[PDB]
Amino acid sequence: MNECAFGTKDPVYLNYHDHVWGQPLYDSKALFKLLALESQHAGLSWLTILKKKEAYEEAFYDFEPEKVAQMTAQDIDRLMTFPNIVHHRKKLEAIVNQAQGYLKIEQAYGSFSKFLWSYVNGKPKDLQYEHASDRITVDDTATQLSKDLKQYGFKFLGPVTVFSFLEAAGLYDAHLKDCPSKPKHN
């Protein structure tokens, strides 16, 4: 559904809308990767990051948190000229701080997935949208999660960005009622 996919026609973006965005994601490492890539979105089109995903994977150990968490200024120095990623130093540093935060969460709570999913009581919040104009960009839960993640050292993940992540990972289902890609919830 065109309306649901923000009126974007580029089929690389539509692929993301159709096969990733809003589909419940329960795997800890996959959640981390999606969150990390979401943090790179700011001030750019999502298509920009999508086309660079494989480059980010090569830059960041396939977003494996134990490996990313150990990266240093020395790695970031190198990555500032690594081809086909966005060379915004604070964005790149943020991915490392996020990986460190993930490890701290898993130390305290066991599972990064269980930590995040707890914010919606273990099942997707169906926002029951019918029109694209129904959509909000932030809420109280995303704001609290943003704050809570900040306490474990996560960076570049403000309330609006976290809200976007919740929708992307399917913790929130923001697909329109008549979108072919709207997931079934039981």
168 lies in the site for Zn ion, by CB under 5 A: no
What is the token pair recorded at 133?
């104009």
Cα separation, 139 vs 59, in Å, equals 33
Q: Is 46 a catalytic residue?
A: yes
Side chain identity, residue 38: E
From CA 99, how far away is CA 28, in angstroms rounded?
A: 12
> Which structure tokens are listed for 168?
């992307």
Least separation in angstroms between residue 148's CB and Zn ion is 28
> Is 16 one of the catalytic residues?
yes
Residues 3-22 within binding reach of Zn ion (CB under 5 A): 4
Question: What is the distance between the alpha carbons of residues 23 and 184, in angstroms, rounded to a whole number?
Answer: 9
Q: How far apart are CA 26 and CA 44, in angstroms?
A: 27
Binds Zn ion (CB under 5 A): choice among 2, 138, 175, 183 = 175
Candidate segments 27-35, 126-134, 142-150, 170-178, binder of Zn ion by CB under 5 A: 170-178
Sequence ranges of the binding site for Zn(2+)? 4, 17, 175, 179
Residue ranges in contact with Zn ion by CB under 5 A: 4, 175, 179, 181
Catalytic residues: 16, 38, 46
